[PDB]
Design a protein around this ligand. Sequence first.
Ligand SMILES: Cn1ccc(NC(=O)Cn2cccn2)n1
Length: 191
Amino acid sequence: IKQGIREVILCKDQDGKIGLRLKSIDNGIFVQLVQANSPASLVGLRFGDQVLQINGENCAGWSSDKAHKVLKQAFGEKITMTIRDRPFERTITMHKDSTGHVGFIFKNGKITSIVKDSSAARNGLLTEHNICEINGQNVIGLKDSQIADILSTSGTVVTITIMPAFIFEHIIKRMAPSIMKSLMDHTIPEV
Ligand SMILES: Cn1ccc(NC(=O)Cn2cccn2)n1
């Protein structure tokens, strides 16, 4: 989770897409889905990011619908956004023990218990928090087994980005799980 605000310059693809769904939350606008191989993914928008301005115009108070409308009505040449980095999220760094554990249970993406004397316990991981990213990679909408596999196939150092479930559940509402599993970019970033 980086220092406040950054600007991004987008550019509709050949189909007039940017690869983005937005969600109105507490009178802001937040990123709900970022499509793989899209302008939004290429410029590095993330799930949970706040969109402060579009084309210089403030997003405060908008409906999802208006934000989707605004994106349609826009010369594809150059769209500028002002982004606050995943404001609802935090990142925790952990270390595995000899038996390859961080020290928690989760279910449906949501952490449900911390294990005594684990790295997770020492680092202050919280339950009732949906897992959003592991080592910079978005795992929302994946299955527990696949998240479990990403954790198994990480180095010793695991970095997890987590979001309070109440907020998470409010963000992904009206979003079909399959679309999340399919289209939400789950790739390591590109250089
Ligand atoms: C409506 N809806 C879409 C997705 C969803 N739940 C999850 O994605 C759970 N999860 C969090 C991280 C990994 N899976 N609900």
